[PDB]
Symmetry: C3
Subunit: 222 residues, 3 copies
């Protein structure tokens, strides 16, 4: 019910008139949603599927990456320089630098210029290998190469492969949706996601988003 | 006719001849031959953008009247709202007394934004669902012009005047969208309501115009 | 030899083939095979985007020289402008005496912002009309390369050097657009002019670089 003509659509029963002809159920995540007609061209639709999933993979890492140090500081008694994700980058400018987990023996980076231009070379080469191949194999598929990147062979079965593609893109869209939550939540409340959540569950009727509705993405206008 | 077909009005007047794409043929309402960014070269995308544009235009038409009415009512009709300016109207739900319609505490008198929010989700969620796939008030025969229960006075029964009404609708809407964009930037830049801006301007148009606030970037006084 | 056709230079160097869309074949200037978002898969849109890009590149090329000239002239040529920094240059029309060209009160000496604005509307309005459909300086034979009155020195008469000049034009223009993007973000972040940023940087590059302002979001010091 996630592929083919009898798949799930993005409006449930009210989908009978809101699914374009080119969204036929072939690709993962096809809920028949393209109201803006941005993927009518088959080549562009291929590009947007590549844009979407690559984003979804970064968001999946992002939600765990943003929540982990804040959850470790608030519930694991760990002492980071800055454990909140939107302030975490700034701990490179403090005295002592960026000590991993607060431990000065771990990483302990002192120069943002080294962090920056090391990432440029590594990610520059790594992304170059993604489009045209490199040390860890040939780029047989822009999203699912599954050579060195499927060591446990979880994509070997063609039938479960089709279902795993669905699980990947649905969890990824949830992660992207959450990362967008982090962004506006941080501008609006000024606090980290863990702290936002904790404050909310304590008094959900009083600790929700509408408390900050008088600000425009942080800015207190009017 | 001068709003359809090959001799219709174009978006550059006489300087148009060389700035009209081949796929803008004069078929749909509002076709002034303007798609310089080639965003509607695909016929299917063009179909979506016409639906986006008109659906926007209908919200803008309601918006301009919706934004101006309580402010015009307060400034010239002596009505006492909690917040009569559109961009401050939402905040009245957090004020004491809540959202009193027309200022009357016996009208609406809403106290909970959470109730306003999740009521609109259900009502608009179904209403938009009925728009794409039909529902209680008929079948969604056309994404923009169903005209069943939504043409009760049958003004679209004549094919010729129907074509002229479609033109009037999309032109008034683009004017409304263009005006709502005015509301947005005027509020960020001046901080006042549209009615007050209009009144202040005609008082001294040479001194009360936009360039007084050009040193601010959409409200922010940078540099 | 290496900027057109199948053996041209691409936007990822050796890692490029397999990251070049089928519709980027080497025919047009600047074709490094970069359209990862597939925004130009449609031939007609791709035609529009090439016009958007090049017209921007020409405005950016004029922009970089226009933004750097008064700031470099004021700080290194002993010239006294009213406001020599580009993002402050527009505001000098609101000061007393107005916009004196090069600071000399006998040059221009504009006093009305409304006069500058609505003269530009008429002049640029007609000029852009002449660009799409032709006019006094000839017919619009080509949307980007008319080369009638706009190639008086006939530098594009040789077909081979024309092909190379087209390449140089788009590469210098993309650098200018990329640089203008630098001006925009640099001014929001640092609050200083491009020349002064350059001068401050070369004095102590390890301490006078962008990361000093990384805690601000395009000017705003949030968090
Ligand atoms: C003959 C001259 C003629 C000209 C030049 C135009 C030109 C235009 N028309 Mg047409 N029309 C003309 C005749 C006619 N029009 C129409 C019917 C229409 C219609 C329905 C519409 C147009 C629209 C437009 C605009 C669309 C292009 C654009 O956005 O450029 C503008 C781009 C620019 C770069 C101009 C800006 C210059 C300005 C000085 C910038 C200001 C500087 C700021 C202060 C600095 C900013 C700072 C930063 C930080 C923000 C454009 C101004 C459309 C419109 O209104 O969209 C806006 C539209 O919807 N025209 C008819 C009836 C048949 C005509 C009769 O001859
Ligand atoms: C999402 C973007 C982002 C990406 C793709 C990376 C990617 C990387 N970082 Mg990271 N970083 C990123 C944001 C940030 N990093 C850091 C601080 C670091 C440090 C201290 C280190 C990395 C390192 C690395 C590498 C991982 C192990 C080698 C890899 C190239 C490591 C590295 O490059 O060592 C060679 C390493 O020591 N990053 C901060 C805080 C300033 C960030 C955001 O503000
Ligand atoms: C693409 C994913 C991503 C990225 C860019 C980052 C980025 C960062 N993490 Mg992080 N993290 C991530 C995923 C990610 N995380 C995930 C998925 C986990 C859980 C396994 C963690 C667990 C984690 C811890 C426990 C710590 C970081 C820390 C850091 C910072 C320094 C990292 C370092 O020294 O490298 C090496 C940096 C802001 C360190 C830091 O400064 O905390 C804020 C730190 O102590 N991260
Ligand atoms: C919910 C998370 C999730 C899920 C279900 C998948 C699912 C899949 N990924 Mg995937 N991926 C994810 C997150 C996820 N990914 C993230 C965050 C990244 C960025 C590091 C990637 C990077 C990635 C690459 C580079 C490759 C895959 C591949 C695959 C496929 C086979 C591997 C597999 O069964 O994964 C199992 C996943 C889990 C059991 C999740 C456990 C959570 C820890 C399958 C469709 C491979 C493929 O398609 O082979 C043909 C492949 O080459 N993914
Ligand atoms: C300039 C305004 C304007 C104009 C000219 C039109 C014109 C048209 N609309 Mg449209 N419409 C508008 C605004 C407008 N609409 C707005 C703001 C909305 C938002 C709800 C809609 C929603 C809408 C729907 C959902 C439908 C139409 C339909 C129609 C067509 C038949 C109705 C008609 O003749 O109305 C002429 C309009 C007026 C004379 C203006 C009336 C103004 C008063 C103040 C309204 C008072 C309301 C009580 C016609 C092309 C129907 C259609 O085409 O089906 C065949 C159809 O299904 N319109
Ligand atoms: C590095 C920048 C650059 C380059 C290489 C070109 C190159 C070209 N332009 Mg272009 N142009 C530029 C900037 C540039 N232009 C800018 C900034 C504008 C905005 C005014 C224009 C506006 C423009 C128009 C309107 C036309 C051209 C034309 C031409 C072509 C023939 C003229 C020529 O060789 O000029 C070479 C330029 C130089 C050698 C440098 C001069 C630099 C100083 C500052 C003057 C050629 C492909 C013509 C064409 O193709 O018609 C056949 C044409 O009609 N250009
Ligand atoms: C004729 C020959 C020339 C025609 C022509 O050129 O005009 C064509 C035409 C209209 C033409 C021209 C425009 C575009 C005026 C806009 C001027 C823009 C202004 C004043 C902007 C001010 C900006 C401010 C205040 C601040 C901005 C931002 C700044 C600083 C920064 C902030 O952070 C943001 C802020 C505040 C936002 C026709 O209507 C066309 C037509 C019609 C009707 C139908 C026909 O029958 C007859 C005819 C005549 C042709
Ligand atoms: C479908 C559709 C149909 C219509 O027809 C048209 C349409 C409506 C337009 C269209 C709809 C489309 C929609 C809904 C679009 C939505 C897009 C969204 C929300 C994208 C979100 C993506 C967000 C990402 C990648 C976040 C990555 C996080 C990282 C990096 O991995 C870090 O956190 C890294 C990190 C960590 C982990 C810790 C910190 O310390 C430091 C930093 C660097 C911040
Ligand atoms: C039916 C069904 C069956 C399946 O079997 C399972 C299923 C699929 C799950 C299920 C489907 C269910 C469906 C359709 C769910 C639909 C949910 C919707 C639309 C809910 C809408 C929520 C809207 C909200 C909270 C508004 C937030 C605004 C705030 C507060 O924070 C601002 O302050 C706004 C604001 C302001 C004022 C200023 C800005 O600066 C910042 C921001 C935050 C933007
Ligand atoms: C043509 C073209 C060709 C090229 O090739 C490419 C191109 C250049 C891109 C392209 C050009 C495209 C152009 C010009 C795009 C312009 C877009 C614009 C301005 C759209 C504006 C739309 C805005 C809307 C719907 C307003 C809604 C208002 C409401 C809702 O009713 C309320 O006020 C509701 C409301 C609220 C919520 C607050 C409360 O207090 C009460 C009230 C006031 C009623
Ligand atoms: C290989 C090769 C071969 C050919 O033969 C010749 C060749 C082609 C030349 C050559 C090609 C080379 C290649 C591939 C070059 C690659 C270069 C790259 C990727 C450069 C990386 C740069 C990254 C930087 C500095 C980050 C800057 C951001 C800052 C700090 O200044 C902020 O403040 C961040 C910031 C924040 C945090 C808050 C916001 O508000 C504002 C901003 C500014 C965004
Ligand atoms: Mg044109
Ligand atoms: Mg030609």
């Amino acid at each position: 019910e996630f592929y083919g003509p009898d798949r799930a659509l993005w409006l449930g029963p009210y989908s009978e008139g809101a699914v374009p002809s080119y969204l036929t159920g072939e690709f993962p995540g096809d809920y028949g949603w393209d109201s803006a007609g941005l993927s009518a061209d088959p080549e562009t639709f291929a590009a947007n599927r590549e844009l979407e999933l690559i984003h979804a993979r970064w968001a999946m890492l992002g939600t765990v990456g943003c929540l982990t140090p804040e959850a470790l500081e608030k519930y694991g008694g760990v002492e980071f320089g800055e454990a909140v994700w939107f302030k975490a980058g700034s701990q490179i400018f403090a005295e002592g630098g960026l000590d991993y987990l607060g431990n000065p023996s771990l990483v302990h980076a002192q120069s943002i210029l080294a962090i920056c231009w090391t990432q440029v070379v590594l990610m520059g080469l790594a992304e170059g290998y993604r489009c045209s191949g490199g040390p860890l194999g040939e780029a047989t598929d822009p999203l699912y190469p599954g050579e060195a990147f499927d060591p446990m062979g979880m994509a070997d079965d063609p039938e479960t492969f089709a279902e795993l593609k669905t699980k990947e893109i649905k969890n990824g869209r949830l992660a992207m949706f959450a990362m967008f939550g982090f962004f506006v939540q941080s501008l609006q409340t000024g606090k980290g996601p863990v702290e936002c959540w904790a404050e909310h569950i304590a008094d959900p009727v009083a600790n929700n988003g509408f408390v900050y509705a008088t600000k425009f993405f942080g800015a207190q206008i009017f």
